[PDB]
Design an enzyme around this catalytic site. Structure first.
Site, PDB file in Angstrom:
ATOM      1  N   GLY A  16       0.801  -1.212   0.000  1.00  0.00           N
ATOM      2  CA  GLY A  16       0.000   0.000   0.000  1.00  0.00           C
ATOM      3  C   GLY A  16       0.835   1.262   0.000  1.00  0.00           C
ATOM      4  O   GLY A  16       0.453   2.264  -0.611  1.00  0.00           O
ATOM      5  N   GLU A  27      18.871   7.165 -24.945  1.00  0.00           N
ATOM      6  CA  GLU A  27      19.118   6.456 -26.197  1.00  0.00           C
ATOM      7  C   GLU A  27      18.206   5.248 -26.348  1.00  0.00           C
ATOM      8  O   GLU A  27      17.682   4.988 -27.437  1.00  0.00           O
ATOM      9  CB  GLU A  27      20.583   6.021 -26.267  1.00  0.00           C
ATOM     10  CG  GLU A  27      21.584   7.164 -26.196  1.00  0.00           C
ATOM     11  CD  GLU A  27      21.727   7.897 -27.516  1.00  0.00           C
ATOM     12  OE1 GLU A  27      21.334   7.331 -28.557  1.00  0.00           O
ATOM     13  OE2 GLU A  27      22.234   9.038 -27.513  1.00  0.00           O
ATOM     14  N   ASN A  39      16.670  -9.981  -4.558  1.00  0.00           N
ATOM     15  CA  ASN A  39      17.200  -8.625  -4.649  1.00  0.00           C
ATOM     16  C   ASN A  39      18.474  -8.575  -5.479  1.00  0.00           C
ATOM     17  O   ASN A  39      18.695  -7.606  -6.214  1.00  0.00           O
ATOM     18  CB  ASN A  39      17.456  -8.066  -3.250  1.00  0.00           C
ATOM     19  CG  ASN A  39      16.194  -7.985  -2.415  1.00  0.00           C
ATOM     20  OD1 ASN A  39      15.164  -8.558  -2.768  1.00  0.00           O
ATOM     21  ND2 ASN A  39      16.269  -7.270  -1.298  1.00  0.00           N
TER      22      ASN A  39
END
EC number: 3.6.5.-
Lengths: 169, 25, 230, 432, 50, 439
Positions: F144, F254, F228
Site C-alpha cells: 500500500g 538512447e 534482490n
C-alpha cells in the site's frame, strides 16, 4: 507616434493617449475619419482589452463618439470588432460609469443600419443591458444609458433569435 | 519551423473549441 | 428519481436495453439488485405499465439482507418495429425511490467492418474502387454518416451520408485515384443512427510503385553467353 | 594557400576521424607529442593542408568535433593521440540526442550551433583560400545525422563555392542499430540530395563480410573498419596531399564523376585486401589489381553492382608502374564486359596514378565508382518507411517535439521521384 | 439551465476573450497564409504530373 | 552529466535500493565507511563514480537516493545495519502510520501528510546535481505504501518536471502465488496512474524468479536476498554505459526513446542472462549466440507468458563484458531467420548494440559466479497482455459483490474510480489487441 504610446509599459501614458484621441475624435467626423484611415481604432481597442480600470473610459467614449458621428465610421469600428470589447467592459469592470459608457457606446453603434444592430446582437450584449437596467443596484446614469442603448438598438435590430428572449424579460 | 507550427496549431485548436462551445451552447 | 443505484440499493445493469428484438418473440433479460446499505431492507417493485414488458421474479424472503442480490427477469414480446420505453419503480424504506429505464429498439446486425484495409499497388493515372457492403437484416431504414479524422485528396468516398434501405444493402464506394508515387492513408469513422451507437473505425491505405524486373536481364546475359557459345 | 578544413559529427564519425588522423600522422612521420619525426621529402611542403604552421614547428590538427554527448571527447582524448587536438573544437552539449533526428536538430541544434559556426568561421578566416570541407559522420543516430545536414546547409549558404564531400554510413536491414533508423535515414536523404555536393556510401556489414572472408581475422572490431576507411580516405586524398605525374583533385572528380546533381552517390573501394598469411605470397602487377577493383567481392557494397550498368568510374592508383597497362586493361574490359556499363557513353573510367607510394605499403590503389547497385537500398528504405508510416508507429516522439508529419510525406514523395529517376536511367537505351 | 446559461454566457465572455485572441490570429496568422498558403500548393502539380 | 536520482518507496523498494547500493560499492571498491582507507594495497576506485555518488572536499561519498517508508520498522531495520555510516538519517523518513497493503489511507489520509518534506528533499538533491536524465522509482503494487504514496508522489513529479525521464520498477502480483488478498485492488488503481502519468513501466514477478532459481541455481530453500541480487544485477546492466564507457555507449535516453513505440504501449519484457550458479558457470562454454537464443526462451523470462502467443514490436538488447561484434552479428543473423520467433510485417529489424568493456564482477557471499560477459534484453510484445486480462477478470469477479470495499468507502474515495480503472484497462487491452493484429 501617439498610437505607439498605447503599447508602452506605463499605464497613465496610455490613459493620456486615450484622452487625447477622445478629445480629438469628438468634434467633427473628418478628424475621426483621419484617425480611422491612420489605423488607430484597432490600437485603441487592443489597448482597452489589454488594460483595466478608468483607463478604458476615454477609449470607450472616443469610440462611442466615432460611432455616433457617421455610418462609415461606425462600420469601420464594427469591422475592427469594437462591440465585444464593449461587452467585456460592461461585464468585467465592476465600476458603474465604465458600464454606463460601454452601454452608451453600444447604443451609438446599434443606432445605425440594421447590420450594425445585428453585429451587436450576436455578441450577447442585449440580455446583459436588460439585466443591468432591470438591476436595482445599478446607478441612475447606468440605467438611463442602458435604456437609451436598448431603444437605439431594438429600433433597428432584425436578428429574431436575439429579440425572442425579450418577449419574456 | 515548429514555433511556426504553433501558429496554425493554436488557432486550429481554438477553432475546435469554437465547435465545442457552439455545440454546448 | 435516482439512477443506477441508491444509498440502499444498487442495480446492474443500470439501464435495460432490448436491442435487435424480433416481433412476437419472447425475449428475456436479467436485472440484479444488491443491498448497499448495512441494514436489512424490504424492496417494492411496481410492475411495468405496458403490456409488452412482463416482470417476473422470485421472492423467498422479504428483507433483502445486506450483500444479497435479487435476480429479476423481464420478458418482452414486441408487436411492431419501433422504439419502446418504460420505467420500473423500486421502493426501499423511506422515500428511497429508484428510477430505472427500459429501452427496446431494433439494432442493425453485426457488420463486418474492417479496422485495416491494405490495398494493392495502382499506378499513376489509374484508379481503384472498393465497395463496403452494409447489410441490413431488419425491415427498417438506418441513417449512416461518415467522418474523416485525417483525410487525403487521393481518396474519394461515395456516399458520405445516406440511408440503408429496409432489409436492403448499402454500398460505400471508396475510390483511390493515385495522385503521387507513394502511400496515402485515411483514418475514417462511420457514425450510425441507432440507439447507443458506437461509431465504427477503419483505416484505408493505397500504394503506388513501378518496377523494372531484374531477372529478364539475367536471361538476356545468358542469351549473350549462348551467342558467344558458337 | 590551398588547405582543407575537416569536420566531425557522430560518435562513429568521431572515432573514424580520430583513426584517420592517427593513420596520417603515422604515415607522414608525426610523434604523438606534436613535433615532427618524419624522414620523407613531400611530407613537409604540402603538410599544411591538414595542419597549421606554428612556433617550433609543432603542427596542429584542423578538425572540429561536434557532439551532443560529453562521453565521446573523454574516450577520444585518452587515446595515444587524443592529446594533440584542439580542446576548443570539442564543442559538446549537456543533453544527448537519443537517436532522434528532429529533437536533436531543434533542441540540441539551436543554442549549440552558434559556437561551432563561430569556430569554423574563425578557422576559415585563418587561412588564405580554401577548396572544400570534409565531414565524416554516420546516419545511425541524432548526433552525426541531425547536425551534419544542418552544418552542411549552413556552410553552403555562407560559402557556396566550396566542396561538400562526406562519407556518411548507410544503414542495412540485416545489421541495424536504431529502431527508428529508417526514419532518420529518410530525413537525411532529403538534405543529402538537396544541399550536398557529393556523398559516398559507407556500410559496416559489407566490411565485416569482406574482412571475415578475405582478411580472415580472429576478432574483427570497429577498429579494423576505422583502419580500412582511413586507408580509403588517404587513398582518396593522396591526389592532392602527394602530387605525382597525373594529379587530380576533389572538384575535378565531382564534376567528371557526377552526371546529374540529383545522383551524387558513389561506391568506394580498396584493392589489396589479403590475409595475414598471404602477404608474403602475392604478385604485384596491374591485371590482378584490375580484377580485384572490378569484381564485386572486394567491393564494400552491401549489394550487387552486376544488377545494373556502370555509369562513371575512376581508378586512382598510388605507385610507380606505368600508364599503358591501365588504359589497355580498361579498353579490354569495356570490350568484353559490354553489358555492364552505359554503351551510350564510352570511356567511363578515369585514369589516375600517384607517383608517391604510401607509407608501409609499396602498392595501393583506390576505386571510386558509381555503379547501378544503390537502387536496391533506396527501394528497400522506401518500402520499410512506407510500412512503418502506414500505421504511424514511433511517431508520437517526433510529434511531441513539435514538427508536423507533412515533412515525412514530402520526403517520401522525394524518394519516390528519385528512385523512379534511378530506375529510369538504369536501362539507358540508345534510341526508341 | 437558466443560471448555467448565465454562466455559459460568462464563460462565453471568457471564450469571447478567446475570440479576442482569435482576432490577433485572424489579423496576422492568416495574414501570412494569404500568400504562403497559395505559394505552398501550386507546385505539387509540377511534381505530380509533368 | 549523466546523473540520476533513485526513489525507494515501501519495504521492497528500500531493500532493493540497499542491494543496489551495496552492489555499486562492492563493484566500485567503495568501502562501507565512506572514505578510501585502502592506503596499503589499492584495489580499484579510480573511475567515474559521480554518476551515483558524490565527492566531498574531504574524500567522502554521499549516496543520492530517496529512502521513504510509511512504517518505521523497516527504517529501524536498515538503521541498525552495518552500512548506517554511509547514508544520512535525513534521507530515511520514518512515519507513525503505514498503509500496509492499503491504497485509500496511504493516498488520502496518510500519504498526503508527508508531502512537503519529501518534496524539499528531492528538490535539494536535484539542486546538488548538475545533469539530470531520469529517475529510479522503486515500489510495489501489492504494498500500500509503494502504491498510494508512489502514485501521489509521481503525479507531482510529472507536473514538476516534464523534460525528465520517469522510469518505473515494481513487482507484479503473480496469478498462481500471492502474498496478500487486496493486491488487485491496489494494482487496478496504480496501473492507471503509471499508464496515464508515466513514460515507461517494468513489471516482474517472483514465481518466475523461483522457477529460474530452482531450475538453474538448483536451490531448495530460496530467500529474498537472491531475489534482490538478481534485480540489482538487472539494474546495473541496464545503466551500465552510464557509469563507464564502451564501444557504443547507450544512455538512458538512447534506449528509452525507441523502447516506447506508443504512449499507451510502454511495457517492455526484460530478461537477464546468464542466470547461473557457481557450478553452472565452470564446465559450460559460454558464447554470445547461445545466450542470445536462450534470452528468448519463455523459461528464462521473468514474466510467465508464452512469447509464441504473440509477436514483437521492438527489441532492445544490451551487453556487458568481453563481447565481440562478430558474435553479435552472427546471433542477429541467426535470430532474424528463426521461424519460432514471431514478429510483424512492418518491423523487419530493430535493436541496439551496447558494448561495455567492464566485465560484471562478483560478490563474496553470493551465488553468482565470475562470467566473462553478460546480456540483457528489453523487447515489446503483445503476448504479455494476458496478465492484464487475468487481472481484469479477477477484479471483475471481486467487484461484482463488492468484497472488502466498505473499508475504502469509509476512508473516503469515489466508487466510480473502480469503473473508470476497469474501462481504462479494457481500452488498453483493446489497443493492445488492435496493435497485435497485422494486416
Amino acid at each position: 507616434v501617439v498610437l505607439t504610446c498605447l503599447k508602452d509599459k506605463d499605464e497613465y501614458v496610455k490613459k493620456n493617449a486615450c484622452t487625447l484621441i477622445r478629445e480629438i475624435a469628438k468634434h467633427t467626423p473628418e478628424l475621426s475619419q483621419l484617425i480611422v484611415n491612420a489605423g488607430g481604432v484597432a490600437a485603441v481597442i487592443d489597448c482597452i482589452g489589454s488594460c483595466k480600470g478608468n483607463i478604458r473610459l476615454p477609449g470607450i467614449m472616443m469610440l462611442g463618439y466615432v460611432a455616433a458621428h457617421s455610418e462609415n465610421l461606425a462600420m469601420a469600428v464594427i469591422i475592427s470588432k469594437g462591440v465585444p470589447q464593449l461587452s467585456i467592459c460592461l461585464s468585467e469592470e465592476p465600476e458603474d460609469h465604465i458600464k454606463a459608457a460601454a452601454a452608451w457606446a453600444l447604443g451609438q453603434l446599434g443606432r445605425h443600419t440594421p447590420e450594425h444592430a445585428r453585429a451587436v446582437a450576436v455578441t450577447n450584449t442585449l440580455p446583459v443591458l436588460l439585466s443591468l437596467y432591470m438591476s436595482p443596484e445599478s446607478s441612475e446614469d447606468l440605467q438611463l444609458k442602458s435604456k437609451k442603448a436598448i431603444k437605439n438598438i431594438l429600433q433597428k435590430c432584425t436578428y429574431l433569435p436575439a429579440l425572442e428572449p425579450f418577449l419574456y424579460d | 519551423r515548429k514555433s511556426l507550427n504553433l501558429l496554425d496549431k493554436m488557432h486550429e485548436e481554438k477553432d475546435v473549441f469554437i465547435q465545442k462551445t457552439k455545440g454546448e451552447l | 428519481a435516482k439512477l443506477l443505484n441508491n444509498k440502499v440499493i444498487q442495480a446492474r445493469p443500470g439501464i435495460v436495453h432490448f436491442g435487435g428484438y424480433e416481433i412476437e418473440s419472447k425475449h428475456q433479460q436479467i436485472l440484479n439488485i444488491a443491498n448497499i446499505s448495512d441494514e436489512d431492507t424490504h424492496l417494492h417493485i411496481l410492475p411495468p405499465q405496458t403490456k409488452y414488458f412482463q416482470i417476473n421474479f422470485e421472492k423467498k424472503e422479504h428483507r433483502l439482507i445486506p450483500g444479497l442480490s435479487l435476480t429479476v427477469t423481464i420478458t418482452f414480446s414486441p408487436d411492431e418495429w419501433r422504439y419502446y420505453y418504460d420505467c420500473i419503480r423500486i421502493h426501499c424504506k423511506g422515500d428511497d425511490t429508484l428510477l430505472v429505464p427500459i429501452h427496446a429498439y431494433p439494432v442493425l446486425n453485426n457488420l463486418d467492418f474492417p479496422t485495416f484495409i491494405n490495398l494493392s499497388d495502382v499506378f499513376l493515372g489509374e484508379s481503384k474502387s472498393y465497395v463496403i457492403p452494409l447489410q441490413c437484416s431488419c425491415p427498417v431504414d438506418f441513417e449512416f454518416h461518415i467522418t474523416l479524422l485525417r483525410s487525403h485528396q487521393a481518396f474519394t468516398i461515395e456516399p458520405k451520408s445516406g440511408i440503408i434501405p429496409a432489409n436492403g444493402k448499402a454500398k460505400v464506394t471508396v475510390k483511390f485515384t493515385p495522385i503521387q508515387y507513394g502511400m496515402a492513408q485515411i483514418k475514417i469513422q462511420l457514425w450510425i443512427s441507432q440507439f447507443n451507437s458506437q461509431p465504427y473505425e477503419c483505416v484505408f491505405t493505397g500504394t503506388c510503385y513501378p518496377n523494372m524486373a531484374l531477372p529478364l536481364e539475367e536471361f538476356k546475359r545468358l542469351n549473350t553467353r549462348s551467342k558467344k557459345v558458337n | 594557400m590551398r588547405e582543407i578544413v575537416h569536420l566531425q559529427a557522430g560518435q562513429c564519425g568521431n572515432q573514424i576521424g580520430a583513426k584517420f588522423w592517427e593513420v596520417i600522422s603515422d604515415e607522414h612521420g608525426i610523434d604523438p607529442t606534436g613535433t615532427y619525426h618524419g624522414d620523407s621529402d613531400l611530407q613537409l611542403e604540402r603538410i599544411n593542408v591538414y595542419y597549421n604552421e606554428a612556433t617550433g614547428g609543432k603542427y596542429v590538427p584542423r578538425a572540429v568535433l561536434v557532439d551532443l554527448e560529453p562521453g565521446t571527447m573523454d574516450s577520444v582524448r585518452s587515446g595515444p593521440f587524443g592529446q594533440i587536438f584542439r580542446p576548443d573544437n570539442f564543442v559538446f552539449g549537456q543533453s544527448g540526442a537519443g537517436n532522434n533526428w528532429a529533437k536533436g536538430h531543434y533542441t540540441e541544434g539551436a543554442e549549440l550551433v552558434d559556437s561551432v559556426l563561430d569556430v569554423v568561421r574563425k578557422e576559415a578566416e585563418s587561412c588564405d583560400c580554401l577548396q572544400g570541407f570534409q565531414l565524416t559522420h554516420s546516419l545511425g543516430g541524432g548526433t552525426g545525422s541531425g547536425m551534419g545536414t544542418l552544418l552542411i546547409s549552413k556552410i553552403r549558404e555562407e560559402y557556396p563555392d566550396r566542396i561538400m564531400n562526406t562519407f556518411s554510413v548507410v544503414p542495412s536491414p540485416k545489421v541495424s542499430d536504431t529502431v527508428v533508423e529508417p526514419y532518420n535515414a529518410t530525413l537525411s536523404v532529403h538534405q543529402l540530395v538537396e544541399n550536398t555536393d557529393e556523398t559516398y556510401c559507407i556500410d559496416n556489414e559489407a566490411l565485416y563480410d569482406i574482412c571475415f572472408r578475405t582478411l580472415k581475422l580472429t576478432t574483427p572490431t570497429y577498429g579494423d573498419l576505422n583502419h580500412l576507411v582511413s586507408a580509403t580516405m588517404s587513398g582518396v586524398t593522396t591526389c592532392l596531399r602527394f602530387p605525382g605525374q597525373l594529379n587530380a583533385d576533389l572538384r575535378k572528380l565531382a564534376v567528371n564523376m557526377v552526371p546529374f546533381p540529383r545522383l551524387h552517390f558513389f561506391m568506394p573501394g580498396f584493392a589489396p585486401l589479403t590475409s595475414r598469411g598471404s602477404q608474403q605470397y602475392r604478385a604485384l602487377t596491374v591485371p590482378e589489381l584490375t580484377q580485384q577493383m572490378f569484381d564485386a567481392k572486394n567491393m564494400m557494397a552491401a549489394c550487387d553492382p552486376r544488377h545494373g550498368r556502370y555509369l562513371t568510374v575512376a581508378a586512382v592508383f598510388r605507385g610507380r608502374m606505368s600508364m599503358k597497362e591501365v588504359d589497355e586493361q580498361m579498353l579490354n574490359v569495356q570490350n568484353k564486359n559490354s553489358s555492364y556499363f552505359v554503351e551510350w557513353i564510352p570511356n567511363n573510367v578515369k585514369t589516375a596514378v600517384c607517383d608517391i607510394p604510401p607509407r608501409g605499403l609499396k602498392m595501393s590503389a583506390t576505386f571510386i565508382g558509381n555503379s547501378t547497385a544503390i537502387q536496391e537500398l533506396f527501394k528497400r528504405i522506401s518500402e520499410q518507411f512506407t510500412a512503418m508510416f502506414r500505421r504511424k508507429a514511433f511517431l508520437h516522439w517526433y510529434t511531441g517535439e513539435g514538427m508536423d508529419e507533412m515533412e515525412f510525406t514530402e520526403a517520401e514523395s522525394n524518394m519516390n521521384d528519385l528512385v523512379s529517376e534511378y530506375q529510369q536511367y538504369q536501362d539507358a537505351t540508345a534510341e526508341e | 439551465e437558466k443560471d448555467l446559461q448565465s454562466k455559459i454566457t460568462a464563460m462565453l465572455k471568457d471564450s469571447e476573450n478567446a475570440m479576442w485572441h482569435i482576432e490577433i490570429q485572424k489579423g496576422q496568422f492568416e495574414d501570412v497564409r494569404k500568400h504562403h498558403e497559395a505559394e505552398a500548393e501550386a507546385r505539387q502539380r509540377g511534381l505530380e504530373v509533368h | 552529466m549523466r546523473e540520476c536520482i533513485s526513489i525507494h518507496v515501501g519495504q521492497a523498494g528500500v531493500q532493493i535500493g540497499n542491494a543496489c547500493w551495496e552492489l555499486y560499492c562492492l563493484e566500485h571498491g567503495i568501502q562501507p565507511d565512506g572514505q578510501m582507507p585502502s592506503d596499503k594495497t589499492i584495489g580499484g576506485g579510480d573511475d567515474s563514480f559521480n554518476t551515483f555518488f558524490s565527492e566531498t572536499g574531504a574524500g567522502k561519498h554521499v549516496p543520492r537516493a530517496v529512502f521513504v517508508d510509511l512504517e518505521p520498522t523497516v527504517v529501524d531495520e536498515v538503521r541498525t545495519g552495518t552500512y548506517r555510516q554511509l547514508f544520512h538519517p535525513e534521507q530515511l523518513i520514518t512515519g507513525k502510520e503505514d498503509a500496509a497493503n492499503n491504497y485509500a489511507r496511504g493516498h488520502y489520509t496518510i500519504g498526503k501528510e508527508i508531502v512537503d518534506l519529501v518534496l524539499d528533499r528531492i528538490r535539494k538533491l536535484a539542486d546538488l546535481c548538475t545533469g539530470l536524465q531520469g529517475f529510479l522509482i522503486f515500489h510495489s503494487f501489492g504494498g500500500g505504501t509503494g502504491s498510494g504514496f508512489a502514485s501521489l508522489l509521481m503525479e507531482r513529479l510529472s507536473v514538476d518536471y516534464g523534460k525528465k525521464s520517469k522510469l518505473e520498477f515494481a513487482i507484479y502480483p503473480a496469478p498462481q502465488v500471492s502474498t496478500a488478498v487486496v493486491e488487485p485492488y491496489n494494482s487496478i488503481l496504480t496501473t492507471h496512474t503509471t499508464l496515464e502519468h508515466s513514460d515507461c513501466a517494468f513489471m516482474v514477478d517472483n514465481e518466475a524468479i523461483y522457477d529460474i532459481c530452482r531450475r538453474n541455481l538448483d536451490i531448495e530453500r530460496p530467500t529474498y536476498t537472491n531475489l534482490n541480487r538478481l534485480i540489482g544485477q538487472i539494474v546495473s546492466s541496464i545503466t551500465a554505459s552510464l557509469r563507464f564507457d564502451g564501444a557504443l555507449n547507450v544512455d538512458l535516453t538512447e534506449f528509452q526513446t525507441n523502447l516506447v513505440p506508443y504512449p499507451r504501449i510502454h511495457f517492455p519484457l526484460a530478461t537477464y542472462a546468464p542466470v547461473i550458479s557457481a557450478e553452472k558457470a565452470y564446465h559450460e562454454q559460454l558464447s554470445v549466440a547461445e545466450i542470445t537464443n536462450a534470452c528468448f526462451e519463455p523459461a528464462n523470462q521473468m514474466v510467465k507468458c508464452d512469447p509464441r502467443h504473440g509477436k514483437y514490436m521492438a527489441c532492445c538488447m544490451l551487453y556487458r563484458g568481453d563481447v565481440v561484434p562478430k558474435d553479435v552479428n552472427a546471433a542477429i543473423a541467426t535470430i532474424k531467420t528463426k521461424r519460432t520467433i514471431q514478429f510483424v510485417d512492418w518491423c523487419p529489424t530493430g535493436f541496439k548494440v551496447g558494448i561495455n568493456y567492464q566485465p560484471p564482477t562478483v560478490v563474496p557471499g553470493g551465488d553468482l559466479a565470475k562470467v566473462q560477459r553478460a546480456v540483457c534484453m528489453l523487447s515489446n510484445t503483445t503476448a504479455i497482455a494476458e496478465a492484464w486480462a487475468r487481472l481484469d477478470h479477477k477484479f471483475d469477479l471481486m467487484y461484482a459483490k463488492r468484497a472488502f470495499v466498505h473499508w475504502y468507502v469509509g476512508e473516503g474515495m469515489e466508487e466510480g474510480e473502480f469503473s473508470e480503472a476497469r474501462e481504462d484497462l479494457a481500452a488498453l487491452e483493446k489497443d493492445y489487441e488492435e496493435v497485435g493484429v497485422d494486416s
